[PDB]
Amino acid sequence: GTNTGGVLVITDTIIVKSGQTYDGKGIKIIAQGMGDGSQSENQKPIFKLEKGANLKNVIIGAPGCDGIHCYGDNVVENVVWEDVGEDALTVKSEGVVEVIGGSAKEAADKVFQLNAPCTFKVKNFTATNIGKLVRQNGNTTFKVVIYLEDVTLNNVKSCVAKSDSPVSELWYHNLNVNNCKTLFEFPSQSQIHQY
Ligand SMILES: O=C(O)C1=C[C@H](O)[C@@H](O)[C@@H](O[C@@H]2[C@H](O)[C@@H](O)[C@@H](O)O[C@@H]2C(=O)O)O1
Ligand SMILES: O=C(O)[C@H]1O[C@H](O)[C@H](O)[C@@H](O)[C@H]1O
Ligand SMILES: O=C[C@H](O)[C@@H](O)[C@@H](O)[C@H](O)C(=O)O
Ligand SMILES: [Ca+2]
Ligand SMILES: [Ca+2]
Ligand SMILES: [Ca+2]
Ligand SMILES: [Ca+2]
Ligand SMILES: [Ca+2]
């Protein structure tokens, strides 16, 4: 990537507009004044992806702040979270959201937080030292469908995925998990399927 070795220091959330692709070309981003990457719920996202916005080829350095906010129909490709903040990426509004490539590390709690009905696919992705890979917002009963395809996880302190919704589903294909308490916390294990 042509921005590789550059560090971009930002002081506000980067807004990517509907239909646009923000291509970092390998830039590393370090956010200032947007949060400390703790579990405080009051930090800013590094990126806000409007519905139909895409993001690719960015390394997000510490502090991870509130990661990437996705408003739906978003492709997030080859994004590396060096040090996840409060959470890495949140689905804020309905649509399809795909994380393809990249990796995440050092998530004290969630990597992916799903706050609206969505189809959420994680493909060709690695994560190390995480609490949960995927959480549907606690105590909600709207439907998410999660796909984990070619995903490798190491050191999962809580679980791979958690939902409190009976109608939600998780499908996985080529999922490799090392050092994990419990793979899935859903109302019923029959919500979890391979393919
Ligand atoms: O980001 C959170 O703290 C959070 C997200 C979930 O939507 C809520 O259910 C709640 O999660 C609890 C707990 O508060 C949190 O600290 C961690 O232990 O995960 C829990 C979980 O149920 O996922 O808070
Ligand atoms: O709830 C749903 O819409 C779906 O649930 C499962 O995924 C089932 O395999 C589908 O055939 C469809 O019924
Ligand atoms: O009900 C609780 C709220 O949704 C709040 O906890 C959210 O902000 C969520 O943790 C997140 O990080 O998006
Ligand atoms: Ca948290
Ligand atoms: Ca949170
Ligand atoms: Ca958050
Ligand atoms: Ca962290
Ligand atoms: Ca179903």
Side-chain angles (χ1 to χ4, degrees), residues 39 41 66 86-87 109-110 113:
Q39 286 301 301
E41 297 289 358
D66 218 62
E86 202 275 316
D87 40 24
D109 183 20
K110 250 70 78 179
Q113 173 81 33

Side-chain angles (χ1 to χ4, degrees), residues 87-93 95-107:
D87 40 24
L89 173 153
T90 312
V91 179
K92 300 285 274 171
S93 183
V96 182
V97 172
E98 301 180 60
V99 177
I100 300 176
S103 58
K105 310 166 96 173
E106 301 308 315

Side-chain angles (χ1 to χ4, degrees), residues 8-15 29-34 44-48:
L8 179 62
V9 174
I10 68 171
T11 61
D12 207 13
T13 303
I14 295 162
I15 297 178
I29 301 190
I30 312 280
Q32 291 195 351
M34 293 168 58
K44 295 175 169 206
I46 309 305
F47 286 88
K48 173 182 183 189

